[PDB]
Design a protein around this ligand. Sequence first.
Ligand SMILES: Nc1ncnc2c1ncn2[C@@H]1O[C@H](CSCC[C@H](N)C(=O)O)[C@@H](O)[C@H]1O
Ligand SMILES: Nc1ncnc2c1ncn2[C@@H]1O[C@H](CSCC[C@H](N)C(=O)O)[C@@H](O)[C@H]1O
Lengths: 277, 277, 197, 191
Amino acid sequence: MRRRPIRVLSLFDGIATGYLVLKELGIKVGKYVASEVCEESIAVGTVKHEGNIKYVNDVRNITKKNIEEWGPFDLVIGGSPCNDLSNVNPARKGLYEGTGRLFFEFYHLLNYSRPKEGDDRPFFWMFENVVAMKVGDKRDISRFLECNPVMIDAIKVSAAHRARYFWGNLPGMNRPVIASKNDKLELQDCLEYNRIAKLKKVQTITTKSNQLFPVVMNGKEDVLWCTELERIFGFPVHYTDVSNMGRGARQKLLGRSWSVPVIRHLFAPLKDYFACE
Amino acid sequence: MRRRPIRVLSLFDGIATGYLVLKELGIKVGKYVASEVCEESIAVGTVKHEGNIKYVNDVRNITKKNIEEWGPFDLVIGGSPCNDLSNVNPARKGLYEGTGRLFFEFYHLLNYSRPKEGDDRPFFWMFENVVAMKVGDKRDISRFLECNPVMIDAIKVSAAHRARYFWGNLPGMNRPVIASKNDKLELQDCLEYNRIAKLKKVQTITTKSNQLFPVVMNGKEDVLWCTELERIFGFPVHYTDVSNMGRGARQKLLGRSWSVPVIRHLFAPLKDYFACE
Amino acid sequence: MFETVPVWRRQPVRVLSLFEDIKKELTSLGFLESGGQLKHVVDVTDTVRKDVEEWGPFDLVYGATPPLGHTCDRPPSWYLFQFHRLLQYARPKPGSPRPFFWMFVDNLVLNKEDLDVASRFLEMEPVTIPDVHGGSLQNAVRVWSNIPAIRSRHWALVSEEELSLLAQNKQSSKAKWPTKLVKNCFLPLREYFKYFS
Amino acid sequence: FETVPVWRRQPVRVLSLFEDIKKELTSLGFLESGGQLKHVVDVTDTVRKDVEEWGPFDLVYGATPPLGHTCDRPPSWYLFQFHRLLQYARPKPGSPRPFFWMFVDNLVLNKEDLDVASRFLEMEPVTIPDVHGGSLQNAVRVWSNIPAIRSRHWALVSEEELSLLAQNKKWPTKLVKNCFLPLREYFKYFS
Ligand SMILES: Nc1ncnc2c1ncn2[C@@H]1O[C@H](CSCC[C@H](N)C(=O)O)[C@@H](O)[C@H]1O
Ligand SMILES: Nc1ncnc2c1ncn2[C@@H]1O[C@H](CSCC[C@H](N)C(=O)O)[C@@H](O)[C@H]1O
């Protein structure tokens, strides 16, 4: 074989974390097809990566013919919505109703993009979701993906808790995570000038607003700025300073994000199968 | 006869435009005392320049003893508020009440800071305000400052109209402005990816939001983004992505700021008078 | 489509029937004989791919949601999603093509939004099989399947309002599965497998 | 400015801004009948050269219109212009000499206008009231470096009683004329 650029199908793409990681690793991307419906999430992916992403809309309007002509794909990634799978949402609707049932669209589209059994080309995939789901949901997801997840917490490579399950077949998914020198492991490393962290790892961040006041500046307590939020999640500073987005919109996007240092741990072994620079 | 770091007094400092320009010119700043009372405007200068600015709150609580202890000063700059001097406002209160009278605080503290007799050390100063003021107030200001202004429109070096009067004694204030080619002289130079400019020069921006829809993206109207505004004024991108500020706060701050390529022009001759890199 | 199979080597059907059991029906049209060539299971939560291979090979995979009125343990879409999962476990690997058929039936249990999910995962829109007497609609089922003549049996005359109201009154009454409606749908298959007289 | 002996006292040279205190200064023997006074009312077009060419001044007086007279200006205009022209007239630091200045307000300055007047004149005002029968009839506030003017203050008068007077209502030059008397130790008395 000869290593060629990678072709990615990103479902529930969000703020294009997947494209960010692959480009940051030095991997060539031939095609990055993203399924995402939030126009603010699409806005940041469109300009931060300058139109290299081919956005599609509802995951549920992608047909088998769509997969055939948009592809072939080498990497199918996705992190379906979580508000109906998370335990400490009292009004959760479970894996089968609400937004939780969107997982099956990933499982459906995965087998569509899966290569034939005569074809033995490299094909990797990865599905992410929350650890705080009922054991019945975690079980059913493994039954459909035909594999068990690996649990990787962002606390080991970032300054915040974020335990998430990771189903997939990526090379070395089970190898131990080790932080880099460039990873900011304590909250103080992610703050702006003249800002003191009371904690050194803050609690799992969600879409919603003394853990709500975890920094003290000039004796007074304060909330975190989005520039600091972007550092906690490992994103480039000002990654979400797009389309006049304010405090609420930027936290919503980052609140449901991937912790990119965890993703670059997962995606790093992928250099060997696809062309780099 | 030896170059020493410049010592600045900046009244109505705003978002530290004066300090930014001086450092960009490679001039060593020994002391930068800024009088400013807008909390978010002070957060910008605090973070973007990492505590090198000494903030001293209201300009009307600065005493003669304050000037002599904080000083001596080599450069005294100021741009007193404009909402009560400009033809824009039907409720305009004139130069003598409202916020227009704040000019006299600059005139007062300028005479305090001016060097004694017998001392002829270099002493530079500059006062800015709007062109769109009744002729009676423009001449009254010229009577107190004892000099006539030069008019510099940012249209010659920026991508927007911004005609402003400049009183002062800076070297080469009357010399013609000629733009660098790093300057972004038309609106299309300052826009993000996949956004088309309708004009080459946008009409002067103020603190508040046809020509209020100067960009078309994907065939539809749209307003300017915060980052696009920052480049129109010559600031670094995300210069105002500070402390959870949204579109409204950021346009308030940049709407009343200086266009920094105009300040770079005015301040540039000062390199030959103070220690530099 | 698959090809005509001559009578001499037409072999007995191997059926995997999920959630509901259609042995009494299939045996009444001569697809089974009294003796088990049909595997029946209703809780597939812990069944995996090899279990389907152990019980198999299968020539027909059947699944159906609980009868109307009988309030289910599961969410209605659960029977659709699980049927799709295990159906994939039983399909012939493309290298060895052979007659393979499948059928999913809904007794007006899936709501409107679950129907698009069903039609999307099974790659066809349902077939309305009604049970009308005296010119009035008594019952109906929705059918997805690849069985050759399955479409033609559709009643375009039955509306979605006529169906949605039918589901209203009969669940309000709160009737077991009316297997007569789907019984004739298996008949185009005896040209592929054995007939037991 | 330590005082002058009676032989060498010269006629005072005064600059009266806005209002004319010529007649008041004659009756005190500061001017002789027949002119050491320059009185301007509209100083809008006055530049430092004009104040310089008009002979060196020893006293710079300025005052706002009377309380009743409906005003041409904003009240702060008389303060700011006084401060500007005062700087033009004061001696250059190389040649110290007797120089005095006085600014007077007849309850025309607003509450906000007072704080900036005291910051620009670097002194808290002096309350010179006109009280007869135990009730306050009129009053003025003055800022000046004339030697004996602060002890002329009336602490009994308060800001409420002053503004109450202002809401209820010629220039009472009678309240300010006596404050110039400490100056006869510097300039000539004309009998
Ligand atoms: N029906 C649908 N089709 C496609 N995307 C959807 C969708 N419903 C929700 N989404 C998107 O799926 C995302 C799930 S959160 C995942 C975010 C992403 N993995 C990241 O790293 O940023 C949300 O951003 C939401 O906008
Ligand atoms: N009383 C006061 N004392 C000190 N600053 C004041 C003030 N009143 C208003 N200001 C500030 O003066 C500024 C005038 S706008 C001038 C901004 C500045 N030249 C720049 O380039 O950013 C405003 O930011 C306002 O916050």
